[PDB]
Amino acid sequence: EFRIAQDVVARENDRRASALKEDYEALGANLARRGVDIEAVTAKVEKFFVAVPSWGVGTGGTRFARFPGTGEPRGIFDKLDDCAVIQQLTRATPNVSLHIPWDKADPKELKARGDALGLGFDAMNSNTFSDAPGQAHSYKYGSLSHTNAATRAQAVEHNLECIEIGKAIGSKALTVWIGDGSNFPGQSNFTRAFERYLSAMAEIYKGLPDDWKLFSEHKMYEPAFYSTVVQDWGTNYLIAQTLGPKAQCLVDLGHHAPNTNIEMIVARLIQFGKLGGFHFNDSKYGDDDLDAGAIEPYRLFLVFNELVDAEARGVKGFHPAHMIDQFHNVTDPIESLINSANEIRRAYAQALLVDRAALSGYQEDNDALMATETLKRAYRTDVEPILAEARRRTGGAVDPVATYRASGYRARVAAERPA
Amino acid sequence: EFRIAQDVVARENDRRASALKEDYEALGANLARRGVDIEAVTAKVEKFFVAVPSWGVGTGGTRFARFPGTGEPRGIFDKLDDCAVIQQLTRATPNVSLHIPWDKADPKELKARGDALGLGFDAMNSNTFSDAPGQAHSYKYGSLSHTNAATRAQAVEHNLECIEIGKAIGSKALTVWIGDGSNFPGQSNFTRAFERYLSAMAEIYKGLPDDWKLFSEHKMYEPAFYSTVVQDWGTNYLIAQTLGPKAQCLVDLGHHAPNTNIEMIVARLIQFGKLGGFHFNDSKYGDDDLDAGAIEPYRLFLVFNELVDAEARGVKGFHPAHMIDQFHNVTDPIESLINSANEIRRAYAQALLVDRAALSGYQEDNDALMATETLKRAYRTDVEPILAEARRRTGGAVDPVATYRASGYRARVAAERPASVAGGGGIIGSH
Amino acid sequence: FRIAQDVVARENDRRASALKEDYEALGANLARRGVDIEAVTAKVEKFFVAVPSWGVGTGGTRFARFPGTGEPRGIFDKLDDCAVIQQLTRATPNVSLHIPWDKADPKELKARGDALGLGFDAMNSNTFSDAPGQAHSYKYGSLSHTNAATRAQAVEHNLECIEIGKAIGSKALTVWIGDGSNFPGQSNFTRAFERYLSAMAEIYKGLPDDWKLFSEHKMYEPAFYSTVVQDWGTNYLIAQTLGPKAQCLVDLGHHAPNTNIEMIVARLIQFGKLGGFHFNDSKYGDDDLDAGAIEPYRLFLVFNELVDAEARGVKGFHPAHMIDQFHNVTDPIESLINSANEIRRAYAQALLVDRAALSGYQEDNDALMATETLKRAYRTDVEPILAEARRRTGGAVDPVATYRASGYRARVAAERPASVA
Amino acid sequence: FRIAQDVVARENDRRASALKEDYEALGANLARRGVDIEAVTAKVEKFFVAVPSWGVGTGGTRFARFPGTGEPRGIFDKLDDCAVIQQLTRATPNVSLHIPWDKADPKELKARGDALGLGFDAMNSNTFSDAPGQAHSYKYGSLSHTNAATRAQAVEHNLECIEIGKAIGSKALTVWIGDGSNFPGQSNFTRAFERYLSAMAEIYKGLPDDWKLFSEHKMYEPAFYSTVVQDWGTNYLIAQTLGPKAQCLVDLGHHAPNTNIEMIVARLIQFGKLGGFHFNDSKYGDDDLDAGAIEPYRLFLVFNELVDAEARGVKGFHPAHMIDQFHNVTDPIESLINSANEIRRAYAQALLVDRAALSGYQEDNDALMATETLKRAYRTDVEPILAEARRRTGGAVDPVATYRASGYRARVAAERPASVA
């Protein structure tokens, strides 16, 4: 089934086909003069996938308010239908990230809907940073690191349930992000809290299938405003190293202190084999969870530069998980996810254009200016024609958001769904 | 009316009177050696008041979750009852700050309950950063600076209603904090948005009584994550100067960029006569809204140092409004407000101990070390005995939280009020 | 000609074919977008930014300085080097002087400038360091020092800078001082600012009718607790207090972490106090790195506000543009060349913004399309436009490549003695 | 004695009565709290922190250095001044040397230290600046430089520092380098770190059985884009990789804005890699201001983690303590005196925390009482304990007052020639 009528996709592609041909051929000639085969780049770009978050499909909110738009998804099934639109038009988001209990539903039904829509499932996400109705023990003062044994046990069991749901739908990983921490000096004993966390995570690790990975996600602050148990990549590395080979670190771009060199953290984790994956988004102040690349596109490119360099250095067994983790408070969630996925492919494509041999030479000779200009020559390249052609060749739309709007999809679901 | 049994207050005071007498006399002797009359300090401290936020007595939350405790107040009336406890025990929070529509209710009843509890009302707070039921125009894309004229008009009318409510209960000011801004480059035209804001505030200004003040509150970010119309004190100054004499700037401690020298902003606003008031709280990362002085007590003292210096060089008319703006997510709201008000008086008392003449000399002589040590000599002084004696002498508790717990108030209201339920913070819609 | 014309010609010819292909391709793409590439190029070739005399020599940090070869022996050598930057980029016809670093006979400075085809931008005073023979030290301040005689001395220095500027063609004085405190209590914030305002008022009295006085704010460094002119708010208060000739200068790296700098630019323009800019890039503090080398989009967003001002018809808006950078690990000339290029790049992209479309998206609160409208311009590779602008004005298609081909650095290395003490 | 004993005696007697009153009052208050003031004073008397040789001279920024009178020139003058700090505070018996700044015949250094009653803490290498005659420049790095010969030179320098330390009684080497990049792409993050680790392994091989090797992380400066040893995470990787003798040194001002530094301390302790501390205070960057002059509570919270670690009986816990500050606008000796005092103040307050009560409030999630339990200790004015500790051990009740009364500064000013009168 197609959420967007194929005739609309075809019409909107034909409408822009002439211009795309001109732009693609021009870029192809330019890249040829630079010793690059545009076809090789396009081939790789159409193979780059990033998971879409179920929680990014509906309108998000801040601690002050939430302003829903029309046709808001009523539950996970509406969310999957909307995710199908993003994948159909961008062809870059074949998999969806589920969050439990937000997306709790019959696993078999979720799988059935996914297969029918042509969607798979990425890492499962547990939730012990909020209480559900009728919950025995509250996570107000923590979960996996709570001082109360029964509360930690409940948190561990919840994570095990997430694994069971994931096994039924085809997921192969569990991502653990908790709000555990303190808001006041002295409230928590830093070391004892971390010890409790490690012990609880060891229980989750024990119940982790051998064909699964366990990702821990660090965050400097929020909801905890003084200290956070898994506060940065250093603590995260200690966690992954302690737990075992199936445990790795997940880097969410907006979870770092002001001015942090995030691409270096990425490089360090790769060198020590603990880069499990990414949570892409952009930010300017805190964990803003904005559309990827909308604020600092160069930083996104620099992160991908490290990923491509890893392949160039010959790093083996490196297949980091890629996922978008964003909240859309003032835009149509589907449109934001579409352009965010596009931006991630944009940064990747540009990273593929870097002349690695030239860069290596400038690095060895300490020619800082030419080294940085070598990266800029790739980053400054407008790869939109490659992204558009990749989409066109794989069943997507030349201009995804334009096609989405032309389809009238939002108005359609607005009529099918309550206000 | 006394929310806390007088016999309990008396009992818990007597239990700690002996120790307090010893500490107070010891501190008195120490201050005497330093040429300071402890009685003069205590007299000033017992007269220092800070407004308590009605939204502070209810458990707060983040965008991820809210974890209510027992005996959560149902509405403004329950909140007033709880605020009465803070005032009774600390004697430092006689006035309450209301937020509309959260606390909307019959002005006559609000005023009636306040008088019965011995509580007054500080500045009113308007709310155009969220949508209420039946609202004609959404504030999703802004309010006072929204591109849509009808939306700005609705926001203006709401603020005027806040003034009308305040006039009936004894309030003398309106604080305006909005979330207006953008999450993406290009979404808003910075200049046009600010022009719209200024025009809307001018309409609100026209509705201000002669003895009223209009306080605009700046904030770097949140809910807007790229730009905010009233983003810092610079824009705030432009607003206040543009609007008129009754318009001033409100400084919320947790609303500034990392590493900002906040006490300097305070001094600058005082110098140009635009320091409307404060929203006290503490923080480490963003607008954390934590208990005042719980993270950076020296910074709080340094802010008070600027205020007391002004109070010293006689900046007449200068009467900034002091208010606590905090959210309590992991403590009993009443206890946190009690200790926060205490910490504010602590910083004030220490600022009063500064040898101004000595400091001035070291400043003129560029003796940086002795100048800083002159501030430290005041700040290092443990003024707790003064704070406790001030409370005891005015009908309060030597140890407020201790007396609060001994009274069993929380368990009391917990049995009178309906049970609460924990949930999310609205990060996503129902599912 | 600092750089042999035959070298510039040879290197331009070597790259002519590719430039033609790229420029024509971009022109067709822009035409499809309703933009005339020729109109953009014509404006870009007229965008100028002042080159700092202090940026031509290798810079350093408080830990160390690592000079390269052929370091300039003073202002005359510095002007010669600035001439290279202008000849190759054609985007830096004016030089920013700093006194007393560049103190010399005004007549000689003017003669060298004219001979090289260079003019002079705003003068920069220096009361953040002590020069020989000073009766008073600036250790504890200058224009805001507690000692009246010290303030008077700093005022006289600034007036001297104005005299030098008048003689060479300058029309403005930029004042940046380190005045502040390193400890709470050391300074009375208000009295220190009042002293500063009194001293600046005196300097203001010495301004010719057609001169401007620019005050430059900075959050910290050299002062590590408080700084008198710490941010744009205090800066606005200064400009408004002094008069119409006084405006604020915004140095990109002088703001608190995460500050929305482009908004500050918009605010100052709205109130007629945006005197000018000090361009550079940074990641941590006032790093003074090559413009756009760290955050190119931010640079574009600043230019977006500048171009919007013109779009809104702001009257009498002629902000000064200057590069303020230090080059610690690169050939200073090469870094200034590429920095000037990046500045023109961001400017060119700002010119490409479809503001008619943007205005509509802003009115309808279509945040996604509004931001995509800016991105469509920013994502455009305008290098062909910058290169063609250089070709037509006597510059080099690839400035740094031509610079290296000329062997200039090796040449001056043999002519200039390296300091030995 | 640098300071005449009669002066120390006179200035102590002048303040003896007030100290007695305050000490007895605090003793009674602590008694009511179940604490023996005598036990606290005994512990405070034994808490030592190393004084930096580079701290007694006036510091500066990249903009300027404003020396005071009697500036110590050379390590011998510096040791004489360090002796004053130890005599008056009795809290700084050991000095931290920096090579080559303090290079001198080891026998003479040792002899001078012994004569002044001073020992030597960890040695500090310098490959972040170039020395005269140096074969390879550190402009682009040292231990992680791309050039093998440059890395070898850096390694040899560090080995030389170990040799000097062995001769004077030092038992550790602290390695802080500026290695990094100012531009994206300039360095390959991974390869640079691999080179650093290989170089450090060579240095590790030259460590005596009873020596420690401390690596010091820093977010930025001198490198403004990336730094090889940028944070505690990389630092942990270094220490774990090198071996049991390698640990991490935490300099308070070397972290990103808002970082929870006390947590980093706890984490390193838990994994046995907390080598030591570089105490100072800051507000913006690596300001290197007097300890506790900006954020005294943070300093106390760091000490709370140290005292807790000992209370828990953690193994491998025995950190070195050193002051790493620069004094740009004060008498260096006075600042070091009061900074050492502030460090002992924070330590003393940490000793007052009721650990049993705190543990209970933590287990029961009583956040308010847990934080108040820390505040009860922090709010306690321990000055009487610090003063009594000094008085009982040969120091001064009020160190700075005694220092000024002695006229020491004027004395060395008369013995040491300044650049200009």
Ligand SMILES: O=C[C@H](O)[C@H](O)[C@H](O)[C@H](O)CO
């Ligand atoms: O801040 C929360 C983290 O980004 C987590 O990944 C979280 O589970 C996700 O954002 C959903 O709220």
Ligand SMILES: O=C[C@H](O)[C@H](O)[C@H](O)[C@H](O)CO
């Ligand atoms: O961030 C919001 C500001 O602090 C306002 O004062 C607000 O109205 C208050 O915090 C209640 O949410």
Ligand SMILES: O=C[C@H](O)[C@H](O)[C@H](O)[C@H](O)CO
């Ligand atoms: O930080 C100093 C400012 O950028 C000034 O413009 C200064 O005069 C210039 O950088 C030269 O040092």
Ligand SMILES: O=C[C@H](O)[C@H](O)[C@H](O)[C@H](O)CO
């Ligand atoms: O920033 C430099 C580090 O703090 C090092 O410890 C350094 O060796 C010391 O500060 C002396 O410069």
Ligand SMILES: [Mn+2]
């Ligand atoms: Mn995430």
Ligand SMILES: [Mn+2]
């Ligand atoms: Mn997040």
Ligand SMILES: [Mn+2]
């Ligand atoms: Mn507030």
Ligand SMILES: [Mn+2]
């Ligand atoms: Mn707030």
Ligand SMILES: [Mn+2]
């Ligand atoms: Mn500048």
Ligand SMILES: [Mn+2]
């Ligand atoms: Mn600067």
Ligand SMILES: [Mn+2]
């Ligand atoms: Mn250090």
Ligand SMILES: [Mn+2]
């Ligand atoms: Mn340092």
